[model samples]
Structures are given as C-alpha cells and as structure tokens.
Target chain A: SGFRKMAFPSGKVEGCMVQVTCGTTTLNGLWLDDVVYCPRHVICTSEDMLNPNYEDLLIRKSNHNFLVQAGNVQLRVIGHSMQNCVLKLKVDTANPKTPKYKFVRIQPGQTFSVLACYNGSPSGVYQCAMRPNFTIKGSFLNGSCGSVGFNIDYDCVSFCYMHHMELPTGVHAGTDLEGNFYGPFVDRQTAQAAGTDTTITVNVLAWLYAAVINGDRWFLNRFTTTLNDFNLVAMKYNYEPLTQDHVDILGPLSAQTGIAVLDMCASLKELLQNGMNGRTILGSALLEDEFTPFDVVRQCS
Target chain B: SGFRKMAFPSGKVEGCMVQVTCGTTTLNGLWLDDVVYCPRHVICTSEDMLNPNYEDLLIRKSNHNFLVQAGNVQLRVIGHSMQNCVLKLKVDTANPKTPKYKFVRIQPGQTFSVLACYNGSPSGVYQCAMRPNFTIKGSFLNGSCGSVGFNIDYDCVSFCYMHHMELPTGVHAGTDLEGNFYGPFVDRQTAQAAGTDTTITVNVLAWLYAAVINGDRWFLNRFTTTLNDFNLVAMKYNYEPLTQDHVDILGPLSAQTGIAVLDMCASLKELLQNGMNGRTILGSALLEDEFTPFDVVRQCS
Candidate 1:
C-alpha cells in the first residue's frame, strides 16, 4: 500500500475521509496524523476523516469512481502559484524498452489542461516533480503513484499540453465587367464561391498585354510624345478655372471635380505663341465675365 | 535767367521783400505787393525796429533783415503741412557736362538737420515731390524735366569683424608614466603654456607612439587575447567586481585601476572545469554571504 497527501488553504488539519469505490464496494481512509499545512510543505491533508461539512474539504462523489467526504481539504503543490509560474511535467512509463517520457515546456502566463482515462488498475509507482517559478535548478519530488488491489478506472485534467486554433489557406480571386481581372477578395468563402479557373486566366492575359504595350518601342514613343504635348498645353498659362464666386454658384463639388480646357501646341516657339494667346483669352474672359468661350473650349478640347 | 519754383513750411516765406545781397550792394527789385501780404499785414518801421519785440505775430522791425520781416504772405504753394514730404531741386546749369543738381534719397523716419552752415540769403530753387509712406508705385519727378530720379544710400555702425569666442579644436595629447597619452589642450594659449608647438609635425610626434602601439599587430594580438580571456572568465562565473572595493587594492602603486584577481583564469581547462569557484569568491567578498560551490556552478556555468 502507498500513501497520497493533499493540502488545504487553512493552517489547521483535521480528520478528512477519502472514499475509494470499486464498483459497488466503497473503501474509506482517515488521516492518521495532523499534517503541517505550512507554505514549505508541498502536500497536506486533514487529520480527522469523518463528518466533513462546508468548511471541511470534500472531493465530490461522481458516477464513475469514489468520493472523499470530510472537512474541506485542499491540495497544493509547493511553489506552483499560477500568478507567475511555469510548470513542466515529464511522464515515463515503467517498461525499459519503451521510450522515455517526452519533456514538456511551459512559459509563465500560459494555461494548459489535459485529461487521461484509465480502464485497468494503474500500476508501477509514479513520481511528480516541481520547481520554483522561473527557477532552473534542483527539482523537488512532489507526489508518487501506487496501485490499489482492485481494477482502477480514472480520468485526470492536467496543464501538460497546449491547444491551438488552426487557420485556412489562400483565398482571393475575381474579375470585373470591363474584362479586367479585379481582386483577391478579402474573404475565403467569397473566393471559393467565385471559383478560380477562367477569371485567373483572363486577368493574366490582360496584365500580359498591358506589359507588352508598355514595353513596345513604337507604342512607348507615341505615348510619351502625347503625354508631353498634353502637359505642355494644359499648363501653358497657369490659370485657375474655379474662383470663389464660381464656388458660390456651383458649390464645393465643382471646385473638387471641375474640368479645364487645354490648348496643345508643338515646338517651344509654338508653345510660347499659343501661351500668349491663352493668356489673352484668360484675361479677356475674366474681365468681360464671359464664360461661354471657356465652357466651349472645355467641351471641345 | 531760368525761372525756378520754391515751396516752404508755412511762415517760412512770409514777406517776399527779397533782398538780393551779392557782395556789398543790396538790390531791392523784390517787393511786397498785395500778392505777397494781404490780411493783417505788419510792415517793418524805424520805431518798431528800435524796440524790436518780434515775439508776437503782430510786431515787426526794420533793421532785422527787412526782407525777412516785411509781412505775413500767402504764396501759391502755401498753407499745406509737409510732414515728411521730400523736396527736389534741379538747377539748369549752362554746362551740361557738369550738371548743377544732385538727387538724394530721404527716409521719413530720420530727423532733418543742416549739413553745412547757411547765411540768411535764399540758397537755391527746390521743388516739392510728395508721397505717403505706404505708396506702392511712387516716383519723384523733376516736374520741369519730366524725368524721375532714384538714389540710394545706406549707413551702418562700426564694430570688429572677429568672433569673441570659438569652438575647441585639439582636446587631448600628453603621456603619463604608464605610457598612456593625455591631451592636446582645448585652446591655443593652453597648448602654448603646456610647451606644445602648433605645427603638425610636433602634434603628430606628441601622441604618435601611443597610436602606433594601439595599432601594432603583435601588441594588439596580445592585448586582445588577455582582455577576452579575462571577460570570458568573468562571464563564465558571473563575477562582477565593484570598482570601489577592488580598484585600489590590485593595481600598481595602489592606484584605482586594473582588473581584480577573481576575473582571470589560469588555463582554459581550469576555466571550464571550475570557473564557478570564482563566482563564490566574488559573491562572498561582495555580499558577505556564503555560496555553495555546487550552487554557484549550477547558476553561472
């Protein structure tokens, strides 16, 4: 036979009974001595075993196994306060041929739980070891395991293994009405519903064509010339199209998205000549308050 | 004779009995008709000249340059106050090679004073060119010439150009008994007092030996090896010596310099095998508490 110790919060220790039931038969034990419930003591139990009440410790009776009915008797492993402690457990089975227990590592501020179910009697002594929170030194033996005569049936919850949530992979694809490939939708379900085959192919083709057009020598030359000409004419005479008075009539929307007319010219000489004409037009239009020519130019050019 | 126009502050041109005093002769073609004096005219008389109380506007005297004391008169350019107005004078000298008049730029904020002593005869014909202080397009025209004149002049206070203080240049150069170089001094005077020459050759020779020794291959290799070994031993045993405690006791001349005995190891094998002993020594010395050899080894190495 082997002994198991338990601890309680209060310093006092009285008779606490633990019933070990095998099927219909129930076996009970009374604490033989007063255990010192000090901070240094890793395990403690009540000295008296019968008539346990609310203040008395009780390991509740469940359908599968036994119950401990007595004064409240709490169990505490020394130096294992969850506030800032890291606890590691390594379990080694008895058979020498079998692999040794895998090491468990836990950091402070992490929580873990595990459940172990047993069908037959648990045999071979087991040892529990503990270390101070954040300490790297000497391990203190906490508790040991033993086999009772009858067949054993039990389950346990322990902070030995951690659990994590898994996530899905690649989720984005689609196209628009202009035959242009659009997105990489933010959601996975939307991407799945849209499907991947045709849209991806069309998008790649469009992108390839755009790249070729930009890379082609003749096309690039024509594009660059047109862009330069457009800029030169558009900003020839620096004049603001929208004034505060215009804003009063059309509201801020006109100021935000109004269009202006540009006069394009080829060569520097032509640009300067047209620039003078543009300036004259602007001055005349402003002085005469005639917006007809300005609007006409905007529509045509 | 070229005709010229003159304007003055009110009361400056009271009586036009212009007495043209050239040498000893006095020409009196200047007369005071109703054109020169009208309302409350007070003519200079012999009796009034005898008393000669000219404080009141009603009084006048004959002997006191009768041309200036004739009577109060209003001319074409009178009655208007010229607070900060400028006056322009253009003389049509017969010789064009050497123009008779010069232009001057006057600011409103400056007080007007006589540049040279002037006798009591009208000096030269001057014109009034008026403009407000805040005018944007102001021009001072020689109304007679229809040409505008522009002149500029500036004045400044006198002071030394050299700076009173400057940043420090050479801060370190000299050698101690231990063969360590010290300072080049921060200023020229300090360097001179220290018997240091300002020449590059002298400065280079002063600290060149220490610099060369620092860069020497053999010396560097030995110094690095010793320093690294000391650091490794210290870290291996986690022994940190406080300067106050070990600085004076270990060095030559009992000076507060050099490493303590506990920070060095005799051999690499000794360092690996029992470096923790150093930690115990250090801890005992510093904290005055005993540390077990095993505990020290487990903690540091």
Candidate 2:
C-alpha cells in the first residue's frame, strides 16, 4: 500500500507521539502526522505542514481510506479550526472514461455539498478522489446521487451563492457570486445602470467580506489580480490600499468567483452610503475614505 | 516664543521642505515641523512626532495658539488621519486657584464638545492648556462656558455617552458605558437582573467597538487592567485573547471610561446574540468562538 496518511489533517496518528521540551518540562505535540495548524489568517499550504521526520512516524487508522467508491457517496468536510478553504474533487469513472472536475469552496461554518455520482450514468461506479490540498476534517457517508446538484444551506456568508442567477445552458457564461467566471468571458462588461444590478453588487460585497475579513483562502488565492484592481480603485477614492500581497491573493479569487471588479467597487460605494445610514458599521469603517463617488469609475472607458 | 509646532499634525510648516528621492523622482514630504502622521492604529504620542533636530526648525503660524483664554471658547479637535486619540484639558483659573482636570476622549468622525469655563465662576479667565500628548488638530473659538457641559453629537459611536443614567450627588459612582468606573466603588456589583441592565450593556457593546476597532487611544490607555480582565474572560469563552500590549492599553482606558469589566463582558455576550439575529455581522465575526455565555462572569463573586 502507498504510504498511509490521516484522513483529516486533524486526525490522530496511531503509535506516533512527538515530544516538545520547554525548559525542564516535556510536552507532547497534538499529532505526529504531517498535519498543519495555521495560526495566521493567510493560506496554509504544504509549507505549513509538520515535518514527519521519520519514515514510520504514523500508522494510519483503518478508517483512513484514500480511495472511496463514488456511487451515492456523500462526503462532509469541515475546515480545521472552522477556517474556510478550497478543495478540488476529482471524479474517475470505471468505464475507462476521462475524469471530471469540480471545485468546493466553503466559508467558515459551511459544509460543501459533495454527493458523488455522474449525472449521465448510475450503473458506472465512479471513484471520488479528494485531492486534499486543504486543512479540513471530514467523514464519508452513503447517499443516492442524481443530478449532482450541489448547494449550501442559507446563511449571510452563503447568501451570495444562494442568489446566483442562472443563465441558459451554453449562455451560463458570466460571473458567479464568488466573482468566478464561466464559459468564454474575458473582461467583464462595464457596470450596468445603477439599481439595475443591485443583487450582483450586493453579492459582490458579501463575497468581498468573505475573502478579506473571513479569510476565505480560495477567494484570496483565486482573485489576486482583480483585487489589485480593487486596491487601485480604492486608492483613487482615498481609501488606503491593502497590502500588495493581500491584493495579489484577492485578485485570483475575484476572477474565479465571477465578480466584476468595477461592480465590486460600486457595491463598496453603495455599502458606504448605507453604512452612513447605520446598517453596517464595520463595512462603513473599512471603506470610510470616500472623496469621488462613481465619477471616473463609471465615466471612464 | 516656545518652539513652534504645527497646530495640526497635518499642517504644513513654513520653510520646511523634506524631500524623499526615489529613482529619478524626488517627492516632497508634506510637513517639516514637529508633526506626526500615524499610519498604524495605535495611540500616537510625543514619541511619534517627527523630530525637529535643528533649533528654530519652524515658525509658528498666526493661527497656532498654544494657550487660549477660556470664556465660551469652543475648541474643535480632530484626530490626525481621523484616527482617534486622547486629549487632557488642563484648565487654569486666573484667581491663582488650583487647575481642574478633564479628559477628552473622542472617536473617529467625532468632535468633542470642549466649551471651556468652570461652573463655579464666569468672571475668572481660565486658560485651557491642551497638552499635545495626542495626535490631533483643532481650532479654538470663544464661547461662554457656565457648566463646562462637554457632549458629543449623537452617532452610534456617541450613543453610549448620550444615555449615561443620572446619579444624585456623590452617587455618581458607577461604571460609564466605556467600562470605566467612578465614585467610591472599588469593584463593580455583580450583574443586576438581566432586563434591568439592557441599556448599560448595549452602551458597553458600543463602547467596546469604539475602543477596540475605532482605535480609541484614551479608552485603551485608561483601562489596561480592566481590558486584561476582558481578555481573561474572553479566553475562558474560547474567544482568542487580544495581544497583551493591546490589553495593557485598553485596561487603563476602560478604567477611565467608567466601564465595569463584567458589564462589558455582558454586553459582548448580548452583542453576540444580537449579531446572530443579523444586526451586527462584524461584531459576530469578532466573537464567533462562543461555547459558554455569562456563566462564571455573572455568577462569580
């Protein structure tokens, strides 16, 4: 068998106990496996994982199955410390067919819907491979899968995803609530008439909060470039620019979430106006510096 | 004349043009005098002021008056970069009487009402000496002060001070909204009936927001001990404790703001409950690690 690993980063490794000595006291580390516990808000990656210095450092438990058959299997993944992260799902079929891909981006206190089965076939038993580049703990349960309809329960954090307006089959080619784009879109169209796209902008604002303050690594890593655009616009409006590294992270996520940079900017301005009316104080505080309205933003090419 | 300093930390000094050269371009520093532009959220003190190493570095402008005679003098002090700071108004009477002490702690986007004149006498010309230990810019105007009734305009930020429950003579010994306690009381009474203290707790929540997020230096400085109590309690509830330095700063301010530590704790719990109901998102986010509520806090001696 391939080297056994814990099913979750938080899972305990059998017969492995690493000791840390401080002064005269020797304490045991929580886990001896290559698990990571991120103390900071930035993305935790392979670099953050503990070094399993010994070859036989851990004996993975019986439940630590690397491969699970994908017929009606439901997987529930919880982020370590309830910190949101991105997980990629790979679906491999038994009929010598090409694999399918799906992305799972969850917020804190969120559970991504992962009912595994191809929409096209039920007889073909597919294998669901969880490419764990994330810090999460989860369990697998049997389910009856049909259309692969993935969804999250409604909450303010999930509000943006819940209100994603559906486009026609091939025409489903625009920004999603998380600012990720689909189909053949390159640059987003100039903002629509004011009030014409309130939902989009509102969703964008929610998404921005998720990425920035909530520490949603998926959004940060995916929208780095677009976030740089946001930083530039925010500077123009006299708002202090976020650190460059932060912008780079947010830009890629904004691009992946289908959020139009300009629309996000408009929503920010709108949130500020509403904040002045006393609805959202922190939102207002974050974007307090406002000189020009939508003057150059809307008028310029 | 005493060494000239800029009236406002943002004010420009005459005959001072500090240049910062980068590559082929040399940009000019905004001010040359002893002025500070704090980029961080901490309290800017005399240590933060730009050092005027050379004597006679600046010529005092006509508007720069270090001492203003109090008779109805309304002094408007704004924080540098709109970041909040603490100001102590030392009122010296012309009658050779001992000076009276008053503290001015204002938040971002707030203007402290500093109409100087003691309620004891209108005939005495009291000089208002604004100790420049703070990072602020202000203008002085003449006004007839009778009661020295300093008040802030009503905003969510000022909501706590507006509803300070009246206390009879010598009975003014209790916690104010900012967690500062006054009067003869050394310790706050255990929490009263739940409904009997809603307003107090609400105000406390508002005050907590002011000190922590708005970066109110006065509150931070005045309540360091009480803030340490808050951190300890927060840790008990699994809410991550703030940095020790931050606790030290907030402790002194909480003591000065008349905020009772337990009352502040109650307000935080209440705010969390309200946040779950969707009134405050950021507040909820800040205190999300809630396993217990008001258990040891209210019941303990």
Candidate 3:
C-alpha cells in the first residue's frame, strides 16, 4: 500500500515521529520539527506549549490552520502548527469529475474564512496531507473540526526535517548587539561541518527594522549561534579567512533582535583588544581575557 | 586684562588646568579636563597619545591648534586645549588704527578659517585672550604675548576632570545588550558609591551599531558604565524603576553603524544578564559586574 512508504514522508527515515489517531486506531510518520513549531517570541512561545520542559530549542505550538474543501465536503484543518506548512486537502466522494485536491499556504497565525457546506449527504470523506518535508508528532481531535460530520485536528511538533532543505529565511548575519560577527547558517550540521559564514563594511542598520518589530525565535537563535558558527567555520576552513560561503537570506541585520552585521574578523579583534567585556578584572586587579563566547571566538586558526 | 578672567574660559574654576608657554612665561586659566578629549574611535585615539600607562581615563595629549591673524602677520594660535575656549584674538602692531578684537567660537576640535594677511612693514603684535570657565596648569614657551615675533605651542593632556557636570549624552536608560537596565548617573560621587542597574522590550541593537563599525571609547565607556550607573542610581534613588532620567548628548550611535538604538537601561540589563562580557565564568566567579567604564553610572536622582 502507498501508506507503507509514508514512513519516510519527510524524506529522512529517522529521529522524528508523527501520528494520527481516530477512535483507538493510530498511524505514525516522519515529520520534521520546523514544520510544527510556532514563530512567536521565544519567552512567550516557549512557555506557551503544554510541554514546559522544552529545551529552548525551536518554539512552542499554536492553533494555526487553513480551510479547504472537495465537492459537498468542506473541512477546516485545525492545527497547532500549520502556518509554516504547505498542506494538500483531498477527498473521496466517488465523483470522478470534480477537482478533489488543492494546495494551500497557511500564513503563520492566520486562518482563511471559508463558507461551511451544511449538507446532510454523507457521501464524501476527507483527509489532510502534509507534503513530505517537515516532521510532526501529536494528535488531533474530531471535536474541533466541523459542524455535522467527524473532525480531524493535530497538536503538532517536530525537531528535525529531512529531504526538504531548511535555511533561515530573512537572516541578516553581520555582528550582534555585543559587537561580534553574527552570520547565518543552514543548520547545525552545515555549521559544524562547514565554516561557511562571512562579514563587511556594509552597515546592517536598516536591514534590522524587520526583527525589531517582529522578532522571531529562530532568527535570534541562529543569530546567537553566529559567533560559534564563525569560530567553528574558521577552524574548519583555512583557519582565519576574511570571508566564506554564506547562506543568502532576506535580512541584512534584524532590528530589536539586535544582531550586528559588522566586519567578519577585524571587529572582533578590535573589540577584544579595547572593550571591557573582553577583559577580566578582579579585586582591583587587571587580568584575564578569555570570556565565554569571546574566548571561544579568538582561538580562530 | 580680559586674559586674567580667562580662568573660567571654558566655564567653572576647578579640577582642570590650562596654560600657554609663549617663551618661558606661562599663564594659568580654568580648563576642565573632561571637555576636550577626542570622541573618535577608541583604540586609535586611545593609543594615539604617548601615555600608554594611562589610567583607563580621559585620553592623553595631542597637538591641537588653529590659525588666526590680522594685517601683516599670520600667527597660528598654537594652544593645547581650546575645544571649549572662547578666545578673543587681538592685534596692535602699535598702529591703533584697525579694530584688533574679534571673538571666534572655536568649539573643541573645530577651527575657524580666517583669510591670510600679508603686511609689508613688520609690527602686528598678537595675543589671544582665553576666558575663565576651566582650570589649567602648564608653562608657556616664549612668554605671554604683545608686539613680538616669537611663538609658543603647548601640548596638553589630562585624565581626571571635575567641577560643573559630567553626564553622558544620548544615554537613554532602560535595557542593555544582555537584557539589563543600565540607567544614568549624577557624575562621579553618586557612581562611586552605588551599584545597581536594572531591563525589557527595549532596543539596544543600534547604539551597538555605532560601536560596531565605528565604536568610540567614550560611548563604549558610558554604555558600559550604565550598569554601574543604573545600580548606583537605583540605590541613590528609589529602588527599581523600569525607566529613569538619562543624560542626553549628541551621539556615537551613528546611522550607518547599523545596530539598534534601544533603551540604555534595558539594553544594559539584557547585556548584563545574557551577554558574554557582562559576566565572569571563572572559578569563585563571585563576579564584579563592573565591566569597564561601566562603573561610572547610576544616581540620576
């Protein structure tokens, strides 16, 4: 059956687990995390999830969904994480003439208003298909779906996605609020395996208005990782290169999110040499230079 | 003589010293140390002077001068610190004909471009009157002036500045880079005694920009001090207030620098809380949060 190969729905066949249950029958599939979490502010979204023991990794879950239909059947795919998703809604009404499949892009935190088909004809059945990109887990109930017929909803979340590549959308890598080069990356593997982030004379001021107003957790996390990423990349590559292969994202630098897009290596060197944060002072004594992130960064080959 | 009243040339009669050696004869006047130091990028200007053993205080000496003259003779009014000096350039040449007095506002580091004069007969005596608002100490070279040909140039530098006032400009108190409130202060006394700074929903991403591309020592110093400032201000004033009165100055938070111009207190708080330089991870890390010039703020009550 075609359902048997659904094990690799998100491309990679490991790590994540997704499932659907109805009256005791349950199904599992490979769903990635990026597709499940909400993109709100971290402190807000993190505590928002029912699972409070979160790793501060991605983000929390939310009731995000879309509306779609086929023939006499109209269903609103109610979900906790569907905005950053591309889903297809299909139906089997035994009608060979009507279009039964449609794809929709659910804007994060927004839902489309659809007219309900209050038909008493119990001829059509509905099911939702999340494209093979993201990994997801959790359950949906029939109560939150529609008026007369049965319902299907999902409380979704995932940690990793396979097959589909994920890169920060509007990442402006340069320098952070603390004056360190904070570039963008594809993910942890790419970052660890490849020192591919880089920097410049390009001012990242205006490129930040986006984050200042609509600060996102993913970007902040990635931005925070830039220093580590750069140092890692620097060690991986020729040790100390001015620039490297970078992931071209939408942002040059974000706003209130406060990431600096300054010189790759020079600014770090200068700040370390002059800034107080770069030094260690104790008991009216002057000594030490290896500050946490700074210590890790300066050791660039 | 207007020259005697020049003691308060830059305003106030205290902790500053100004004197010109016009030939073994030097005159003292009121010159505040805090007024004329360079506001340029830190390291460059920091290392610019010959004082490497300098206290992490106001910068060292520089050969700062401006040229102004009358009819026959063109003399470069070579002085050490005229940044805030209100000087009246007078000329006699013993002619008693042309008006020999004109006041020029030579704001610190700013110069007035006067036309070069060429006289056939040599007799243009020159003397520049420095008002009294600041206190200075030093020797003049060729002696005080009047109908002469010799000139003197004084090299000046100072660390401690006193009297009048000293409040950081453009210091909006709220939160910092690590998410802490790094507020204001009422100069050295208040800051010397207190140690509290308090942070959230603020923007510091940009004040950082100025520090990023063209980070200035003074700005960095003040920014860092907000921590100490806020704390002291806190203890001296109420206790914990989200916002507090801050010192407003021109700006080092340049537009092209490309960082966030968030609330001073907020950014400082944030930075202190989460920022690398704001903390010490070493053993017995019973740390002192006074990162750098960060020890000079708080007490704006």
User: Per-prediction TM-score, please?
Assistant: 0.10, 0.20, 0.19
The alpha-carbon deviation from the true structure for residue A101 of candidate 1, after best TM-score superposition, in angstroms, is 31
- How much does candidate 3 score in TM-score? 0.19
For residues B1-301, what per-residue lDDT tens digits would candidate 2 score against the true structure?
Answer: 0000101100011111122211222222111123211111112223322332111211221122222222233322122222111112222322121122222343222222211111112111111111112111111111111112122122111211111111211011112223232222222122221111112222234345333422222222222244466555555444434444333443544554566544555556544334433233322323322111111111110
| Candidate 3 all-Cα RMSD | 28.2
Which of 1 and 3 is the better model by DockQ? 3
Regions of candidate 3 where Cα sits further than 4 Å from its true position: A1-301, B1-21, B24-87, B92-267, B277-301
Candidate 3 displacement at residue A152 in angstroms: 72
Candidate 3 lDDT over residue span B1-301, tens digit each = 0000001011011112233222222222222211211111111232333332222322343322222223222333334332221222221222222112222222111111110011111111111111111111111111111111111111121112211111222111111111111223221212222222221111122223223332122223234334455555444433332232222221233333333233344444444454434332211122222111110110000
Q: What does candidate 2 score on TM? A: 0.20
Task: Identify the leading candidate in terms of lDDT.
Answer: 2
Q: Go through the candidates in order and give each one's C-alpha lDDT.
A: 0.19, 0.24, 0.21
Error of 1 at B167 (Å): 48
- The candidates' DockQ values read 0.00, 0.01, 0.01
Model 3 DockQ vs. reference: 0.01
The CAPRI-style docking tier of model 2 reads incorrect
Candidate 3, position B215, lDDT:
19
